[PDB]
Amino acid sequence: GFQAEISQLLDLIINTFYSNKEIFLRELISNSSDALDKIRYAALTDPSQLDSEKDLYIRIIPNKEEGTLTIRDTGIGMTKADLVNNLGTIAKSGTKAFMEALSSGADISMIGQFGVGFYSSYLVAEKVQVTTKHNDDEQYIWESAAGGTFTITEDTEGPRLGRGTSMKLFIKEDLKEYLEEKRIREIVKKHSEFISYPIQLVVTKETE
Length: 208
Ligand SMILES: Cc1ccccc1-c1cc(Nc2cc(O)cc(O)c2C(=O)N2Cc3ccccc3C2)n(C)n1
Ligand SMILES: [Cl-]
Prior knowledge:
Name: Hsp90-like protein
Assembly: monomeric
Strand content: 15-25%
Radius of gyration: 17 Å
Oligomer: monomer
Entry title: Cryptococcus neoformans Hsp90 nucleotide binding domain in complex with BUCMD00452
Number of domains: 1
Keywords: Cryptococcus, HSP90, ATP-binding, Inhibitor, chaperone
Shape: globular
Structural class: alpha+beta
PDB class: chaperone
Bound molecules: ligand W8V, chloride ion
């Protein structure tokens, strides 16, 4: 497909035009919140939809040894067909919409309106590992790196999500401030006041 070129294009453009890198976390939390809204609504008519995971929440897990920041939610998750549609039709179409808004001088502050908000993670990450699990399907993993072509793979080696999506961001070397507890908490409190789901952070005792 065109993930190699799209990821390269959006990596370059997004890092060029969004100097406030901390909005990557706003986009992650907003997308998690939408996925959680989706399973919450589905559970109204089929309560058994929550059998996979009863709790609706967003959890942030930094790993300084690995250099990763993981945002996991217990939202509706993505089927393989959902993920394929994101990588194909949505990425191509939203890149066009984003680039035309960029070109026409239109306001592009809310990048998620173009359907490519996923790529705002390149503000701080050089690679994103997507794990996702929808009630109708198996757990899948897909990796995004600029210029890469990665096949969607059935994830049998990973920890079970139960249900939802986990975005694991491999943070660029100069930007490890985004793994720090106090920095994460300021950003969430600034950019996610109106989120109606618990936002959790794993804090680890430090040596020393
Ligand atoms: C990965 C990718 C590559 C290329 C283009 C786009 C994407 C791509 C993938 C996603 N999905 C998620 C991103 C997240 O940060 C967190 C999530 O929980 C999800 C998710 O599972 N849903 C399911 C669903 C159901 C209803 C409404 C909203 C959502 C979001 N979004 C928005 N965008
Ligand atoms: Cl966890």
